[PDB]
Design a protein around this ligand. Structure first.
Ligand SMILES: Nc1ncc(C(=O)c2cccc(Br)c2)o1
Ligand SMILES: [Cl-]
Length: 446
């Protein structure tokens, strides 16, 4: 087992990683900004290193400072969590070059998945179903670009190869808007990623977001741990996630899961990963792969019993996966509601001091958060302050427990989305299940 690790993150996920480390007897190093001295995981960590001032550029994105922290404490590995540097291939490369273990895949694999065009090409080669598309970058020849759109058939969507997560894209419904749509996507990608490469896909009107969780070790084992539906979104940010995805049969699960696991073997994947699919009319279409552990990982843990963070750490130490595919079984159902410190009318972050706090409890209730009474949510970071995860023997029980748990949850002193989450739980289309990626913004606009 890894002797000591740097937790290169903050808030709920840093606490999540800390708990996993403690369970495995791994010593913890909490690197934190000057604004995060009183984070719960920092207070619980074996060692702490302040790596810079509040702004993320000088702290949680500060590569030299994070690596120096690992050096000075005699740590052997770095867990990047999600966000920040978790998908930064240059960071992973530096970590390994500096002699530390990066908890994640090889840097080359991170780089591959950050290149949406080359990632699609690899998955298609591996036998994973992808969206009908350009199968390559679009050039400057508008005759060729029109020809690609015709072959695919309108409507189409232009996407940035350096983008992802709903960022950097526009829908084209005919020839008249094609040139400008390509030009604008190119410009925005250049400004945001210094990478103007763009590609084209068939536009799917009302798909669901269904993603497959994988784990792969260094012994050549690769498994899939069912799927999650993450369709409930505002401005491409997930609000509610659940596992398994409603309407997905064991046959479909097996079909798509086996292809994801096979792809992992082909590409030499290692660690946790997520294959994102658009799912429409009974068909899966690969769009992107995330290499990090994700925000929504706990719903998968609830239905499989697999502790995914502990698996990441076991994998990094050189241990094989603790479970085989034939030992992975979907049981029950889990729902996650993201708790955000946000204004209900503007949806802008609403930081400040929590005055009263009470977490829900009970059978099937899981609370993932660093927050406590008297804790100040800083303005410098993401609005998500907690995750409420409820499990039941079926979806209806999971939702019932979520409703009860949300009513027990007290967070005073700051504005939160608890009331919105309650509304969603009570929404008759959500209760039916299988709402598409556009549902929430439509519901709120009505
Ligand atoms: N082929 C394809 N269709 C839609 C998509 C998307 O990724 C997407 C996601 C969110 C919103 C919108 Br509009 C499109 O990709
Ligand atoms: Cl994430």
């Amino acid at each position: 087992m890894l002797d000591k690790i740097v937790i290169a993150n903050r808030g709920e996920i840093a606490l999540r990683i800390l708990r996993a480390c403690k369970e495995l007897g791994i010593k913890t190093v909490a690197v934190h900004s000057s604004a995060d001295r009183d984070l719960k995981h920092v207070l619980l960590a074996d060692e702490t290193v302040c790596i810079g001032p509040a702004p993320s550029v000088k702290s949680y994105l500060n590569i030299p400072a994070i690596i120096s922290a690992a050096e000075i404490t005699g740590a052997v590995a770095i867990h990047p969590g999600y966000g920040f540097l978790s998908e930064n291939a240059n960071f992973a490369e530096q970590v390994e070059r500096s002699g530390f273990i990066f908890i994640g895949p090889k840097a080359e694999t991170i780089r591959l998945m950050g290149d949406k065009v080359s990632a699609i090409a690899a998955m298609k080669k591996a036998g994973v179903p992808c969206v009908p598309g350009s199968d390559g970058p679009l050039g400057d020849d508008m005759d060729k670009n029109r020809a690609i759109a015709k072959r695919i058939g309108y409507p189409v969507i232009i996407k940035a190869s350096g983008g992802g997560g709903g960022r950097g894209m526009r829908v084209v419904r005919g020839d008249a808007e094609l040139a400008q749509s390509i030009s604008m996507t190119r410009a925005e990608a250049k400004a945001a990623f210094s990478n103007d490469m763009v590609y084209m896909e068939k536009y799917l009107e009302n798909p669901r977001h269904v993603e497959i969780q994988v784990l792969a070790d260094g012994q050549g084992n690769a498994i899939y741990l069912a799927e999650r539906d993450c369709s409930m979104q505002r401005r491409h940010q997930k609000v509610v996630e659940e596992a398994p995805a409603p309407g997905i049969t064991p046959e479909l699960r097996r079909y798509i899961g086996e292809r994801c696991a096979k792809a992992c073997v082909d590409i030499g994947y290692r660690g946790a990963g997520t294959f994102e699919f658009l799912f429409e009319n009974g068909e899966f279409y690969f769009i992107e792969m995330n290499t990090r552990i994700q925000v929504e990982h706990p719903v998968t843990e609830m239905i499989t019993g697999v502790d995914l963070i502990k698996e990441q750490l076991r994998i990094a130490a050189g241990q094989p996966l603790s479970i085989k595919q034939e030992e992975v079984h979907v049981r029950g159902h889990a729902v996650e509601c993201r708790i955000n410190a946000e204004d209900p009318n503007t949806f802008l972050p609403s930081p400040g001091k929590i005055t009263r706090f009470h977490a829900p409890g009970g059978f099937g209730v899981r609370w993932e958060s660093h927050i406590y009474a008297g804790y100040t949510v800083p303005p410098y970071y993401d609005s998500m302050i907690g995750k409420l995860i409820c499990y039941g023997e079926n979806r209806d029980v999971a939702i019932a427990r979520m409703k009860n748990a949300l009513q027990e949850l007290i967070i005073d002193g700051i504005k939160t989305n608890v009331d919105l989450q309650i509304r969603i739980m009570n929404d008759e289309n959500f209760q039916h299940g299988g709402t598409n990626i556009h549902y929430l913004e439509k519901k709120l606009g009505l």
